[PDB]
Amino acid sequence: SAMKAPELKEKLEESEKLIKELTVTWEEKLRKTEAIAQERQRQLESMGISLETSGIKVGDDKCYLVNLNADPALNELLVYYLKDHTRVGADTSQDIQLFGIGIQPEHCEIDIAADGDITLTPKENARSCVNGTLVCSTTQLWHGDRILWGNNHFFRINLP
Amino acid sequence: MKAPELKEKLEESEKLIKELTVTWEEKLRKTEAIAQERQRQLESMGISLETSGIKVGDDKCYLVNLNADPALNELLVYYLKDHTRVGADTSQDIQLFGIGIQPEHCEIDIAADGDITLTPKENARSCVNGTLVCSTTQLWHGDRILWGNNHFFRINLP
What we know:
The structure is a homodimer.
Chain A: H1 5-37, H2 39-47, E1 49-52, E2 55-58, E3 63-67, E4 79-82, E5 85-89, E6 96-97, E7 108-112, E8 118-122, E9 128-130, E10 133-134, E11 139-140, E12 146-149, E13 153-158
Protein name (chain B): Kinesin family member 13A
Family (chain B): Belongs to the TRAFAC class myosin-kinesin ATPase superfamily. Kinesin family.
Organism (chain B): Mus musculus
């Protein structure tokens, strides 16, 4: 029974309404999935880290802590990236979370100033050593500095 | 705008719904496959990406670069293959840059039975835990390695 133009136009309107709605839906879904799929790359770029077949490259211009402990606790990283304010301690609030003898809930702070100066500020009752010196003052850090937190948490700062 | 056009376009419209659905599904699947593949690449390297940095599997055999000089051309971490040639030449598996590094400096081998050894080369300084070594030397977890004047490494072994 041949449909005439008003009915055809109505059905076409409904069809294209369906296509538009499907488009919005799949726009949502695709943007979500792509956003999550790009996460690793965004992270690595922010940290200036290149993951190669033969190993790990880090950026010439960013600050890193390298774990020197031969037997680190299960939670610890090998390489920590340092952006501008870094909280080190046992609390969940901390950026670098360490569990060890002598490590306080809030143990120390490492700061990168707008002019590039990197400093370490100790917290109350928290033992930090830089290059074998017990830290009692905000202490400027330099490439190759060795940091000891608590009894046996050794790190090397990397800023070439 | 008139009936014939409208009906042709109506059929086209339905088929089009189906086609766009398949296309979008495909692109979704593709995106997901890419994500999964790179995750697998990381897992195969023995790497975990965390909020504050990089975790490396305890099972992984690798060298940590503690160069007393600034780097710029070296890696911070080198993975060890079964046979790893270390030196200054471009043919080496681990190419290091420094006045005390020889074109062919040393070799580190992982035997089938799991033993790890370092075999030094003539005129190339290799020190293991501070001792100058001249012949094939077994390596153990946590050993300190010095190559040349400045290339301090620590080795991670199971």
